[PDB]
A paper describes a structure:
The RAS family of oncogenic proteins is important as therapy targets because of the frequency of activating mutations in almost all major cancers. All family members function by signal transduction to the nucleus of cells via interaction with effectors (such as RAF, RALGDS, and PI3K) that catalyze phosphorylation of downstream proteins. When KRAS is bound to GDP, the protein is in the inactive state and becomes activated by nucleotide exchange from GDP to GTP.
Ch-1 was found in four of the six KRAS169Q61H chains (A, B, C, and F); Ch-2 was again found in three of the six chains (A, B, and C) and Ch-3 was found in four of the six chains (A, B, C, and D).
Residue numbers in the entry: -3 to 167
Write the structure that this text describes.
């Protein structure tokens, strides 16, 4: 019996400065943050309609700048889907994607975890990671790829809605 809308727990991960907070704030508040305020841990919530189902997104915005924590491994255990964010103007953040995915596969103890690869800052000219390289990486993991800009709002909704669609396929 129906007790309230379905709830989805999403975690946004990736290197420091790629725009994990900017994406989330752009989703919740329709606001671009220009200042860079390093995050330890922040939680958000938004109601949306995706494919005709109303649902509640519980979103955890993580830190990039983290050494081993057991607080960290706890939220990777509870979270049902992951946005893996890199910045298209920072090749190191792209190479770090592999580390985030391994860390997740290890704690969930599973090959098949709902994920979306997100290449942020596609508004900047400084592109050092090619769209094709990222699509290939995503195809090799069997997951979707979305190019976003927290500044222009391109792909922001799509990134979160796509993740929810992946979580739905998984069950
Ligand atoms: N041009 C442009 N700048 C962006 C974009 N996304 C974020 N930024 C900028 O990049 C900086 C870092 O954004 P922020 O959201 O703090 O990154 P983060 O991944 O949350 N950082 P942290 O991991 O330390 O919490 C900020 O100045 C922000 O304005 C984007 O899509 N385009
Ligand atoms: C521990 O791991 C995760 C992984 C992914 C998501 C959440 C999560 C993230 C957010 C909320 N809930 C929440 C979010 C924002 C507020 C803000 N407040 C001012 C209304 C309150 C509750 C939540 O509650 C059940 C959450 F569970 C937790
Ligand atoms: Mg952040």
């Amino acid at each position: 019996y129906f007790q309230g809308m379905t709830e989805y727990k999403l975690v946004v991960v990736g290197a420091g400065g790629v725009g994990k907070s900017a994406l989330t704030i752009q989703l919740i508040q329709n606001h671009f943050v220009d200042e860079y305020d390093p995050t330890i841990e922040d939680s958000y919530r938004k109601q949306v309609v995706i494919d005709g189902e109303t649902c509640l997104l519980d979103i955890l915005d993580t830190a990039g700048h983290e050494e081993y924590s057991a607080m960290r491994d706890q939220y990777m255990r509870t979270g049902e889907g992951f946005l893996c964010v890199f910045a298209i103007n920072n090749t190191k953040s792209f190479e770090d994607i592999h580390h985030y995915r391994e860390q997740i596969k290890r704690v969930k103890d599973s090959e098949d975890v709902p994920m979306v690869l997100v290449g942020n800052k596609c508004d900047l000219p400084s592109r050092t990671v090619d769209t094709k390289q990222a699509q290939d990486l995503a195809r090799s993991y069997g997951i979707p790829f979305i190019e976003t800009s927290a500044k222009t709002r391109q792909g922001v909704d799509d990134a979160f809605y796509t993740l929810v669609r992946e979580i739905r396929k998984h069950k």
